[PDB]
Design a binder for this molecule. Structure first.
Ligand SMILES: OC[C@H]1O[C@@H]2OC[C@H]3O[C@H](O[C@@H]4[C@@H](O)[C@@H](OC[C@H]5O[C@H](O[C@H]([C@H]2O)[C@@H]1O)[C@H](O)[C@@H](O)[C@@H]5O)O[C@H](CO)[C@H]4O)[C@H](O)[C@@H](O)[C@@H]3O
Length: 730
């Protein structure tokens, strides 16, 4: 059996073994053609039927190490899985056509098996595309930066697939946006794209993101700005004056129509005007309760009531208060709906209520309602982890199988082109069902299964993890969208669904997510995702928060000092904990590690113990005291942010764009209007230099006044992070 799928698995940055590459073939350029077999073959040929010539290509076996198998298993971050996947990718054949003729054709494959059988594939269309300057569609765009004769349309006999066009950029202009970015604040000089993807660690090195947007601000060195938003949830690409030094080249997927209309919203004025313009279209941050601004405690290996409470007691006994505990390993690890070890009756996959459950005294959670009641009594809110997938593994218990069947039977699942349920193509929870959160009925069906957690157990919010799982431009959603538009939108609908649940139960919409797109602004809180415990990851995380803030993602946090691998070195923890104190959401977290030694918790005491630096507990006391003192400031500035549209974690160009020097210090940022923050991001530093912009500035720790428009240098013991306050009028 020969398998060929023209578009492949549709991982956004990788090719499967069985596809055309490029997936939309282009006349004049090379075309690589791949196929796989279900049993070993000695030979495969590709027959390509042009009208004037039939041609036969002898294909050659693909070495899996040279395929994208490693990337399809999640990349370098999942090294063991990636390596074995490369070895396993051993049934692929490949040929390539160096300069593809501009003529339509059909093609098929023929193989000879080792036992001597000939096998033949179905026939496939080949309709090559070319770039045309004819006005095949219309770009609808105002302003004076559009280049009128730049549009080119990628057309084939089957239709129009992509468009590219250019915008003028001037010599002094800087480009900030495209959502959360991990590499640099100023995107000028780079090529990038906007597509929701899970890059598991090293997001900066790979130049990818969980939370893109097809939007950016362009700011000159006189203080003036303009901005553009491509009004699409399809993929877009940007060459931000990398190839042509005074041109932003934009490329837009037109998706799975004859004369398309591409709308580009534009704004100009101050930097704050431009961002407000975008938020009036995209959505605005929501009002949140004050308790989001205390310390959040988290750790994946806190998987019993006793383990969570032990840590909460430890926080009290050390004088390091927490406002929020995130519990990730709470459920049966099958349905993410029921606490581990809970006993109950089967009910055909219907929504449970609290009285359905009995909790054994020797089980993982002997009284989770008592835990939540008691935590609330101590001033601590409780957040439970979630994923927008339903596992279908053959080893699942009766309840998880019933839940999945009920999901399917409801209709509220994302579907393949052929109407059957989408089976997750990713490396995380492979083959799982994916609920359709694209309509109200779909969102309610999924969230109703969880309602009792809010109404009966009284939890305060959800860590709405994942959301990047939909691959396939021709998937089907109940709102009428296909995958080409729906897949990037998915994380927005997902956070929205859980916000709606919380709100309908008398709570605030506290969802905590990693992925998003245009519209995510209006749905909860966000964290920077998964990273190692390195200095490079610290610097990249600061850039993530500032750039996220520059696209309206206001309630941003990160896993301070990294969550993955060995605990951070003591100095990184110290510098990162200090930095996190001056960011919108302050949170520590640690990855699953099979409950093995050494303990991986990012608690101040575990890190102190393993690094031999007892002083880290004292430092955490100190900075958490500072955090508490900062709470009315964060509340008041958050209010002003909702009114003005300025970020809370705020790039310097929002208040001082007329100062060209700000761009040489892209990891300094304002926290609200009054405080200038400069994290210490190198090991061994005993002094640290900060560029103060125009005005008078007061040292947060010493009271020392400094004149602005200058660099200043500050001694930086671990009990100090450079923070300067504006000196206002009398
Ligand atoms: O890149 C995919 C994925 O890799 C890691 O998870 C793989 C792991 O998933 C399942 O077990 C999970 C367990 O890992 C843990 O996940 C919570 C974790 O999710 C994200 O990180 C994961 C990796 O851990 C990543 O997306 C997120 O970034 C991070 O902040 C979170 O801590 O806990 C849940 C709940 O207990 C558990 O289901 C799966 O069972 C396992 O086989 C697989 O190896």
């Amino acid at each position: 059996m020969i398998t060929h799928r023209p578009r492949g698995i549709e991982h956004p940055y990788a090719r499967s073994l069985d596809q055309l590459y490029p997936a939309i073939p282009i006349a004049g350029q090379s075309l690589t053609i791949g196929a796989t077999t279900s049993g070993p073959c000695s030979r495969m040929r590709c027959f390509v039927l042009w009208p004037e010539h039939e041609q036969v290509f002898d294909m050659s076996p693909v070495n899996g190490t040279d395929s994208d198998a490693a990337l399809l298993a999640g990349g370098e971050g999942h090294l063991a899985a990636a390596q074995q996947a490369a070895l396993d990718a051993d049934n692929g054949w490949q040929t390539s056509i160096p300069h593809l003729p501009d003529q339509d054709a059909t093609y098929y494959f023929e193989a000879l098996t080792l036992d001597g059988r000939t096998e033949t594939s179905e026939s496939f269309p080949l309709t090559p595309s070319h770039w045309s300057a004819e006005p095949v569609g219309h770009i609808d765009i105002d302003g004076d930066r559009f280049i009128p004769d730049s549009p080119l349309w990628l057309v084939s006999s089957a239709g129009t697939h992509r468009v590219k066009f250019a915008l003028r950029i001037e010599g002094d202009e800087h480009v900030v946006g495209f959502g959360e970015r991990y590499d640099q604040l100023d995107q000028r000089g780079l090529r990038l794209d906007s597509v929701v993807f899970e890059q598991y660690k090293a997001q900066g090195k790979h130049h990818r993101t969980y939370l893109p947007m097809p939007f950016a601000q362009v700011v000159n060195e006189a203080g003036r700005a303009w901005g553009f938003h491509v009004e699409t949830t399809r993929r877009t690409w940007y060459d931000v004056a990398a190839t042509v030094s005074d041109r932003i080249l934009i490329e837009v997927d037109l998706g799975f129509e004859k004369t398309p209309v591409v709308r580009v919203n534009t704004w100009s004025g101050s930097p704050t005007d431009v961002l407000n313009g975008f938020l009036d279209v995209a959505g605005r941050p929501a009002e949140m309760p004050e308790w989001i601004f205390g310390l959040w405690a988290s750790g994946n290996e806190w998987n019993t009531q006793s383990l969570v409470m032990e840590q909460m007691d430890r926080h009290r006994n050390e004088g390091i208060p927490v406002s929020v505990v995130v519990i990730e390993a709470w459920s049966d690890e099958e349905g993410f709906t029921i606490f581990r070890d809970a006993r109950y009756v089967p009910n055909q996959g219907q929504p449970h209520r609290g009285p359905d459950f009995t909790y054994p005294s020797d089980g993982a959670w002997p009284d989770p309602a008592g835990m939540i009641r008691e935590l609330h009594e101590r001033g601590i809110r409780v957040i439970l982890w979630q994923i927008p997938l339903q596992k279908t593994d053959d080893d699942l218990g009766p309840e998880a199988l019933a839940q999945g069947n009920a999901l399917i039977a409801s209709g509220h699942v994302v579907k393949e082109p052929d109407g059957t349920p989408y089976k997750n193509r990713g490396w995380w929870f492979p083959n799982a069902l994916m609920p359709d959160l694209s309509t109200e009925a779909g969102r309610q069906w999924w969230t109703e299964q969880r309602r009792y957690l809010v109404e009966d157990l009284d939890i305060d919010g959800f860590k709405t993890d994942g959301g990047e799982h939909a691959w396939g431009s021709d998937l089907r959603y109940e709102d009428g969208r296909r995958g080409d538009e729906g897949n990037n939108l998915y994380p927005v609908n997902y956070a929205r669904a859980y916000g709606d649940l919380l709100r309908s139960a008398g709570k605030y919409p506290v969802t905590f997510s990693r992925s998003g797109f245009t519209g995510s602004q209006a749905h909860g809180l966000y964290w920077a995702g998964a990273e190692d415990s390195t200095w490079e990851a610290f610097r990249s995380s600061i850039t993530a928060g500032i750039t996220a803030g520059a696209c309206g993602i206001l309630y941003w946090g990160w896993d301070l000092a990294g969550f993955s691998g060995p605990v951070p070195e003591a100095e990184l923890y110290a510098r990162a904990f200090a930095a996190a104190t001056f960011m919108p959401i302050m949170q520590y977290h640690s990855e699953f590690h099979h409950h093995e030694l050494p303990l991986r918790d990012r608690t101040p005491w575990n890190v102190a113990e393993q690094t031999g630096c007892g002083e880290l507990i004292d430092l955490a006391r100190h900075y958490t005291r500072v955090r508490e003192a900062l709470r009315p400031y964060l509340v008041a500035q958050t209010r002003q942010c909702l009114q003005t549209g300025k970020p809370l974690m705020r790039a310097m160009f929002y208040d001082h764009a007329d100062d060209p020097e700000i761009w040489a210090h892209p990891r300094q940022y304002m926290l609200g209007d009054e405080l200038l923050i400069n994290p210490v991001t190198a090991p061994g530093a005993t002094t640290w230099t900060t560029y103060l912009p125009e005005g008078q500035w007061e040292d947060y720790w010493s009271g020392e006044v400094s004149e602005g428009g200058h660099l200043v240098t500050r001694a930086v013991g671990w009990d100090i992070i450079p923070v300067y306050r504006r000196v206002g009028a009398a």
